């Protein structure tokens, strides 16, 4: 829909919020990725006055500036095009709208869960007209191995090492679930050359950027040879992928599993954790969407039980033809 490349090993970001632990986790990731510099240029915190914070670049202690006014951070760090918003739900709308007044920001991550859908609809409309990519709300974010990870995504160094998240493979994924995104990190690393980029779009009814938004970016990314989608019950988003393939827009292999098949076996409605998990028509069920995907040429497993098994199968057939 909008840009194709959001992050690189030179991406510099501003962090709205006093989330020291998440910033340090990002820095640890930057280090073992052999980045030249930290990915967090400055933090914003309107509660306290301008100051600087102790952080650790490897074993060496460094400092990152913390500004009270967003206007001062954007001005003193014009290299920033990404903002990771850790604001509480009550203030996430205002701070996000304020961010999109700085045309330097091309990608915003909204962590907070609980933002009224009517408000997020208003955020989407502003970003749509300004070409800003919103990842969220209600997401941990995403990770681009070797280059950039959003806040807590990917966890601590030991997980970044175990899942080989310090260098890219050829497999891009997009999920609604933040926790399952780190499971996809684990599964993909164990069955392929590893993750090239992963995005968690969040569990809300209207995510800032949809599944197809990122699947499209992946179709336009040469280093990406195959795509995994952990879809979900609710809405009709995954149907855009059936369309994309039908129109010749989606050519690379696509693996997809939609979670929420149990809801077809419940005698009445059950709302799941993700605010957008509700199936309002028959076509929004996980079973109905999995079936439509398989008929459109998507590689759909029988169950999540066998998701890693089908990912490995697609990968090896791609290695066979010398695509990887």
């Amino acid at each position: 829909s909008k840009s194709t490349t959001l992050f690189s090993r030179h991406t510099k970001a501003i962090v709205w919020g006093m989330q020291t632990r998440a910033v340090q986790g990002m820095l640890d990731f930057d280090y073992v990725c052999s980045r030249d510099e930290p990915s967090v240029a400055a933090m914003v915190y309107p509660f306290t006055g301008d100051h600087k914070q102790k952080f650790y670049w490897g074993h060496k202690e460094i400092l990152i500036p913390v500004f009270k006014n967003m206007a001062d951070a954007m001005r003193k760090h014009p290299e920033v095009d990404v903002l990771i918003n850790f604001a509480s739900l009550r203030s996430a709308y205002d701070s996000t709208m304020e961010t999109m007044n700085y045309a330097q920001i091309r990608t915003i991550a909204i962590i907070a869960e609980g933002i009224p859908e009517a408000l997020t609809r208003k955020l989407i409309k502003k970003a749509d007209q300004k070409g800003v990519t919103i990842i969220g709300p209600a997401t941990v974010g995403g990770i681009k191995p070797g280059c950039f990870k959003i806040g807590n995504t990917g966890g601590m160094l030991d997980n970044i090492l175990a899942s080989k998240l310090y260098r890219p493979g050829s497999v891009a994924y997009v999920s609604r679930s933040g926790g399952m995104s780190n499971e996809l990190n684990n599964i993909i690393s164990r069955t392929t050359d590893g993750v090239y980029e992963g995005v968690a779009i969040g569990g809300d009814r209207y995510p800032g950027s949809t599944f197809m938004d990122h699947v499209l970016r992946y179709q336009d990314t040469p280093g990406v040879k195959m795509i995994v989608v952990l879809g979900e019950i609710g809405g009709t988003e995954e149907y855009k992928i059936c369309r994309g393939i039908k129109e010749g827009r989606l050519t690379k292999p696509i693996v997809c599993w939609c979670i929420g098949t149990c809801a077809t076996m419940f005698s009445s409605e059950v709302q799941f954790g993700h605010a957008g998990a509700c199936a309002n028509q028959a076509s929004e069920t996980a079973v109905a969407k999995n079936q439509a995907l398989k008929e459109a040429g998507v590689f759909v497993p029988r169950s999540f039980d066998e998701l890693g098994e089908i990912i490995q199968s697609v990968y090896e057939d791609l290695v066979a033809n010398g695509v990887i």
Binding site: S177, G179, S268, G273, A286
Partner: protein, 425 residues
């Protein structure tokens, strides 16, 4: 999430807050009735029940109550009582949901023709809110429709020009004004769905005979002044439990995320999975392996809850599964993905503190526990699980990242064996 409200709650809010040129009739003129209803006290509070004939129907999020014979129309109070006699308090299956009929509305009967029954609906999408109208309202509803953009305003001339093309000419200005007032009320109180079928217009004004609605529960902090102590009923086929209200109350107190819904309180399969998505996958897996009729709950804890928060969540689940022995015992799935930031050590310490205080009952009900979890400090978390399983006698099997996330479900159901070569890994 968007949550359904009762017809009464929706009608109360509409009557109180809608602003319209149209005089809306029979405002607040309804009587709520349950199996406990003191019918003498009801007539004290609502003397109008004897002034005209009535309509009675269940208000429990049951759709097409007419087709199901669940609307008694144009009845005296005595007729309402006789009509309620074989229905109130009785068990009833609607579609595939089975529940008790126990909450009914009694409203005045409004005479009118079929030509005076209209359809109105407003629901939300990503690109905005769609406003629908059909001149052929009623139980047998092709409808006119138009998108109101995100920051767009509903201009009454589009209501008049497009939506009301097929509406009778005389009733067009009152209909235009009501739909305009309805939309503003829809926005102000953060509705995401609002259906009035039928909306009745006679020479005496506008009547809201039926109402179905959902509101954005996340917008309480914005709307609580007008919402009041607002209630979100469970779908027909389920009861509300205090444990659910307890957990929902904790979730409201921190950024942490604590959901819990009881499906089958006598089911021998309980889950305490972390994550909004993982909890769904484990549920998908259990049902995919034939366990849909024994799964007791759906729930998740995530967002880095504290150790105490996790103990309070866990102690709720353990109480619920120690209320009646099962012939074949019971099973507890403590699972999840490799977490990004949730301290697996602090959370499992809280769970382990719950398994200690409830160890006696858990052995009476023959509970077996299965564990798979990764994330920050997961190794220390795995240890105390295996260690409490030994300092109690409760059988626990503890797995880590070297186990597929849902593999422990097949283990728990006997579709695959327990591999002791993966413990604590």
């Amino acid at each position: 999430s968007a949550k359904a409200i009762s017809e009464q709650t929706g009608k109360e809010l509409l009557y109180k807050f809608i602003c319209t040129t149209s005089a809306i009739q029979n405002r607040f003129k309804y009587a709520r009735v349950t199996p406990d209803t003191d019918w003498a006290r009801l007539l004290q509070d609502h003397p109008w029940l004897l002034s005209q004939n009535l309509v009675v129907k269940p208000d429990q999020l049951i759709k097409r109550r007419g087709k199901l014979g669940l609307v008694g129309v144009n009845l005296t109070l005595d007729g309402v009582k006789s009509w309620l006699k074989p229905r109130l308090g009785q068990e009833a299956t609607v579609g595939k949901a089975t529940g008790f009929l126990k909450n009914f509305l009694i409203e005045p009967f409004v005479p009118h023709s079929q030509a005076e029954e209209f359809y109105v609906c407003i629901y939300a999408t990503r690109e905005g809110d769609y406003v629908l109208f059909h001149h052929e309202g009623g139980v047998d509803v092709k409808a006119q429709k138009l998108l109101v953009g995100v920051d767009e305003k509903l201009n009454p001339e589009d209501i008049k020009k497009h939506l009301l093309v097929h509406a009778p000419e005389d009733k067009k200005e009152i209909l235009a004004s009501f739909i305009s007032g309805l939309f503003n009320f829809y926005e102000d109180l953060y509705f995401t769905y609002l259906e009035i079928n039928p909306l009745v217009v006679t020479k005496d004004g506008v009547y809201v005979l039926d109402l179905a609605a959902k509101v954005d529960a996340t917008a309480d902090y914005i709307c609580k002044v007008k919402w009041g102590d607002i209630e979100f009923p469970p779908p027909f086929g389920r009861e509300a439990y205090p444990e659910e209200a307890y957990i929902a109350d904790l979730d409201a107190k921190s950024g942490a995320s604590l959901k819990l819904t009881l499906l089958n309180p006598k089911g021998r399969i309980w889950t305490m999975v972390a994550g909004g998505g993982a909890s769904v996958v484990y549920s998908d897996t259990i049902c995919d392996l034939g366990g849909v009729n024994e799964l007791a709950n759906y729930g998740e804890y995530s967002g880095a809850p504290s150790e105490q928060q996790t103990y309070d969540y866990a102690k709720t689940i353990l109480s619920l599964m120690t209320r009646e022995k099962h012939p074949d015992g019971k099973i507890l799935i403590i699972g999840g993905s490799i977490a990004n930031f949730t301290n697996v050590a602090a959370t499992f310490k809280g769970i382990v503190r719950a398994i200690r205080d409830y160890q006696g009952p858990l052995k009476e009900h023959e509970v077996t526990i299965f564990v798979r979890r990764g994330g920050p400090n997961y190794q220390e978390g795995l240890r105390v699980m295996g260690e409490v399983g030994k300092t109690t006698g409760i059988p626990i099997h503890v797995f880590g990242t070297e186990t597929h996330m849902t593999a422990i479900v097949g283990m728990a159901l006997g579709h695959r064996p327990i591999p002791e070569n993966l413990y604590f890994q």
